[PDB]
Enzyme design. Structure first.
Site, PDB file in Angstrom:
ATOM      1  N   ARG A  65       0.827  -1.192   0.000  1.00 51.50           N
ATOM      2  CA  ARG A  65       0.000   0.000   0.000  1.00 51.50           C
ATOM      3  C   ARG A  65       0.860   1.239   0.000  1.00 51.50           C
ATOM      4  O   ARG A  65       1.620   1.461   0.937  1.00 51.50           O
ATOM      5  CB  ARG A  65      -0.903  -0.037   1.247  1.00 51.50           C
ATOM      6  N   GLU A 104      -6.581  -5.086  -6.315  1.00 56.51           N
ATOM      7  CA  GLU A 104      -6.937  -4.743  -4.967  1.00 56.51           C
ATOM      8  C   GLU A 104      -7.348  -5.899  -4.074  1.00 56.51           C
ATOM      9  O   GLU A 104      -8.291  -6.644  -4.408  1.00 56.51           O
ATOM     10  CB  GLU A 104      -8.028  -3.685  -4.940  1.00 56.51           C
ATOM     11  N   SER A 131      -7.529  -0.332   1.600  1.00 57.13           N
ATOM     12  CA  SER A 131      -7.261  -0.763   0.240  1.00 57.13           C
ATOM     13  C   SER A 131      -5.779  -1.078   0.101  1.00 57.13           C
ATOM     14  O   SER A 131      -4.935  -0.253   0.486  1.00 57.13           O
ATOM     15  CB  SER A 131      -7.689   0.316  -0.760  1.00 57.13           C
ATOM     16  N   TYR A 139      -1.468   4.943  -7.763  1.00 60.93           N
ATOM     17  CA  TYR A 139      -0.748   4.763  -6.490  1.00 60.93           C
ATOM     18  C   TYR A 139       0.692   4.361  -6.757  1.00 60.93           C
ATOM     19  O   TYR A 139       1.071   3.197  -6.633  1.00 60.93           O
ATOM     20  CB  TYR A 139      -1.484   3.782  -5.567  1.00 60.93           C
TER      21      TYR A 139
END
Ligand SMILES: CN(C)CC(=O)Nc1ccc2[nH]c(=O)c3ccccc3c2c1
Ligand SMILES: [Cl-]
Length: 203
Positions: A81, A171, A127, A138
């Site tokens: 993440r 995800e 997430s 991201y």
């Protein structure tokens, strides 16, 4: 510990397979709300606190909670993440951990001092990606921190990529309300540098 690294094909195959029956047992509302979550401006917990508008949010939470409570991750798993310094709190918005692609060593030492061995509660749904840095939304370009998170078998989370607004995020959605410990801080050099922060779930 299962760690898919950069192996998107292997990760997709595992995520679709191992959560197939979970997915097919989701209700219409649960599927709609999962997909909606992946495309939403706001985190519904953060939003519920900030605020027919309030009915929508409570229902989102009821359905997300119900969906994720039905899922259990089948193996000890690493997930990834990307975050900004806001991870450590609102006051860290301007921390300048990274300047011109280079991670500031003394700022890493300060974060380590303040946070290594401490915990935080992830109040919002969490997430994460099954592989490292799959999607430009991201990316290492924007986010100077990679959380490398160790998840024990049994945790409530599910692979949702083929239901997402952005399947290429690969995800793994982890339920809200878990506590995490900051275990290790390491600078990774290429291409921008980044800070890798290892986390573990604290049940
Ligand atoms: N919000 C929020 C905030 C940070 C995030 N970081 C991620 O790496 C990620 C990966 C896959 C899907 C979503 C996210 C993500 C979402
Ligand atoms: Cl930078």
């Amino acid at each position: 510990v299962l760690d898919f690294k950069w192996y998107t094909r292997k990760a997709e195959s595992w995520g679709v397979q191992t959560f197939k029956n979970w997915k097919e047992n989701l209700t219409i509302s649960e599927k709609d709300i999962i997909t909606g979550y992946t495309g939403s401006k706001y985190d519904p917990i953060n939003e519920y606190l900030r605020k027919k508008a309030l009915e929508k949010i409570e229902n989102q939470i009821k359905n997300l909670d119900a969906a994720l409570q039905k899922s259990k991750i089948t193996e000890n798993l690493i997930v990834y993440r990307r975050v900004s310094e806001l991870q450590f709190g609102k006051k860290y918005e301007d921390y300048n951990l990274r300047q011109n692609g280079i991670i500031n060593e003394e700022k890493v030492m300060e974060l380590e001092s303040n946070f290594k061995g401490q915990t935080f509660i992830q109040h919002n749904y969490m997430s994460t990606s099954l592989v490292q840095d799959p999607h430009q939304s991201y990316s290492n370009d924007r986010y100077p921190i990679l959380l490398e998170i160790t998840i024990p078998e049994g945790v409530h989370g599910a692979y949702i990529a083929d239901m997402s607004e952005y399947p290429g995020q690969y995800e793994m959605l982890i339920n809200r309300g878990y506590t995490f410990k900051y275990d290790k801080f390491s600078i990774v050099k290429p291409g921008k540098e980044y800070l890798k922060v290892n986390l573990s779930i604290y049940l």
